[PDB]
Amino acid sequence: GQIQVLEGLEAVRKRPGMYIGSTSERGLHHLVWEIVDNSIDEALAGYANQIEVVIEKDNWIKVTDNGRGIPVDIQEKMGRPAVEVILTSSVVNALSQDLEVYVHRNETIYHQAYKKGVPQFDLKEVGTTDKTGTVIRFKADGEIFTETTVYNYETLQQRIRELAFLNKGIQITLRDERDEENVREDSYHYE
Numbered sequence: 534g535q536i537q538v539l540e541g542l543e544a545v546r547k548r549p550g551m552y553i554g555s556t557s558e559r560g561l562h563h564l565v566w567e568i569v570d571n572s573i574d575e576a577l578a579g580y581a582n583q584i585e586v587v588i589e590k591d592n593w594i595k596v597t598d599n600g601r602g603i604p605v606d607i608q609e610k611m612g613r614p615a616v617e618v619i620l621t622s623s624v625v626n627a628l629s630q631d632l633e634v635y636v637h638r639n640e641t642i643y644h645q646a647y648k649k650g651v652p653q654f655d656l657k658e659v660g661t662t663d664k665t666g667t668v669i670r671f672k673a674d675g676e677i678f679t680e681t682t683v684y685n686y687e688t689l690q691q692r693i694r695e696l697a698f699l700n701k702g703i704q705i706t707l708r709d710e711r712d713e714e715n716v717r718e719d720s721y722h723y724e
């Protein structure tokens with residue numbers, strides 16, 4: 534089970550272009566689409582209706598949704614929490630130098646961090662909450678994306694606007710916090 538996980542990460546890092554199209558600027562932006570697509574699926578299942586994408590200092594990406602939260606129940610097949618199985622099978626996690634998740638579920642905040650898809654510690658209870666949803670924060674691996682790891686605000690804006698237009702009823706917000714002195718936000722919500 535666990536051995537099959539490591540080979541999966543190795544495979545994605547060995548031929549990243551086969552999984553995200555390219556290691557150019559295009560492939561870097563794809564990382565955001567892959568995570569946002571998971572939030573959109575949770576909205577289409579009837580659970581979520583708000584997605585926030587933040588470009589943080591040093592081109593971290595934070596994606597937050599108000600869905601049910603990725604499940605944390607032990608996956609009888611792997612003996613690992615479901616969220617760990619799901620994120621260790623993620624292309625984005627494989628192609629990130631660092632990735633962390635916060636799940637709000639069962640009135641609890643759970644946290645796990647990864648490097649190149651490898652968990653750095655067991656899923657941990659870190660707090661309490663009266664909300665549900667998922668926070669993903671990731672830093673693209675510069676060893677993979679050798680051209681640029683800098684996000685283009687207008688590229689992300691055009692695609693987020695498109696996703697809000699195609700998926701009516703979902704509020705999707707993009708915020709650029711890289712320059713703390715000039716913060717830019719665009720928020721889209723069709724019908």
Ligand SMILES: Cc1[nH]c(C(=O)Nc2nc3c(OCc4ccccc4)cc(C(=O)O)cc3s2)c(Cl)c1Cl
Pocket residue numbers: 568569571572575596597598600601602603604615619667668669
């Ligand atoms: C930013 C973000 N959000 C999500 C996300 O919310 N995905 C979810 N998948 C799921 C989900 O997927 C299927 C599942 C997987 C393992 C164990 C039970 C169900 C189930 C349930 C549920 O049963 O309550 C809830 C969620 S929420 C993901 Cl994945 C990412 Cl990345």
Ligand SMILES: [Cl-]
Pocket residue numbers: 603604605606638639
């Ligand atoms: Cl759960």
